[PDB]
């Protein structure tokens, strides 16, 4: 038996601020780590209504939920039960910038995330502060090892109202609490989607599908 069950629940709390607006979001959900699928129900507990596009937050809301082929070592599942943390810089094409940190632990059949999210320098009339984003496009994150830890780069793109795209570069460092078998360079294909939401995004249901592969 692995400590990572075929079905794992999720509980999380995010505290953060975007362009000075503070907020707290809590989440509950469930997913299938070996299928690479998960669903989360998120609730704005402080700072409602959010004055910025909810989409900039959603990738901060766990690479344990990735379908890993057997010939690629799975850094994330191996990291449990002790867990792992990641930090991420998100640099937007209009020089908006976000930095997030998340600590991921486990108890029983449930992951626990504590997430800190800070963003600023977004133009007040840009698509983030004016809530003109529609969705993230599906993406491909390039995973590589450097300094003995696992890192990932992905070029991201938000579809805008009117058909434009608004671009972002993600740089992530992932660090397990213990030493684990490190993989070779590979890729992770992602698809993240807000399945439903209420008017102001105080309630959001969020889905990701993710799968690792070599080339």
């Amino acid at each position, epitope marked *: 038996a692995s400590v990572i069950k075929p079905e794992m629940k999720i509980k999380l709390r995010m505290e*953060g*601020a*975007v*362009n*000075g*607006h*503070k907020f707290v979001i809590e989440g509950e959900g469930i997913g299938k780590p070996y299928e690479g699928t998960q669903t989360l129900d998120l609730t704005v507990e402080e700072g409602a209504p959010l004055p910025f596009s909810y989409d900039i937050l959603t990738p901060a809301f766990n690479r344990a939920f990735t379908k890993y082929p057997e010939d690629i070592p799975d850094y994330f599942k191996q990291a449990f039960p002790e867990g792992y*943390s990641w*930090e*991420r*810089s998100m*640099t937007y094409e209009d*020089q908006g*910038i976000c*930095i997030a*940190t998340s600590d991921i632990t486990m108890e029983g059949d449930c992951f626990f995330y504590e997430i*800190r999210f*800070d*963003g*600023t*320098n977004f133009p007040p009339n840009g698509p983030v502060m004016q809530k003109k984003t529609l969705k993230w496009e599906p993406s491909t994150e390039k995973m590589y090892v450097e300094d003995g830890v696992l890192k990932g780069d992905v070029e991201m793109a938000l579809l805008l109202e009117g058909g434009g795209h608004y671009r972002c570069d993600f*740089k*992530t*460092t992932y*660090k397990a609490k213990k030493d684990v078998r490190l993989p070779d360079a590979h890729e992770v294909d992602h698809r993240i989607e807000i399945l439903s939401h209420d008017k102001d995004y105080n309630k959001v249901r969020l889905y990701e599908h993710a799968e690792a592969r070599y080339s």
Partner: nanobody
Amino acid sequence: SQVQLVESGGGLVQAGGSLRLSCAASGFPVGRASMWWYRQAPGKEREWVAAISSYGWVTAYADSVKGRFTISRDNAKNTVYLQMNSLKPEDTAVYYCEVSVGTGYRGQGTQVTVSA
């Protein structure tokens, strides 16, 4: 209000010169908030300069300073360093740091003047 922020290292340097700023915070748990550099010149509005994550694993820079400035952080203290190389007159300003975003906690700043 044991929370305090103190920037050090500013000064008068000539164009093409170097300076190493630092920003020391007290009153917070070590390495559990991101830290952010800003600067503000005479009649100009405040500019974001650089940022570093809680644990120091990731960094970010404004386009105007990328490749010239480097941000780093003590793993055991809330102390951040901004190595400023290849300085330009446009870099003249008061530089300050903030813990996290939107906290209201700000330091007095440190004056950087770059003489053409």
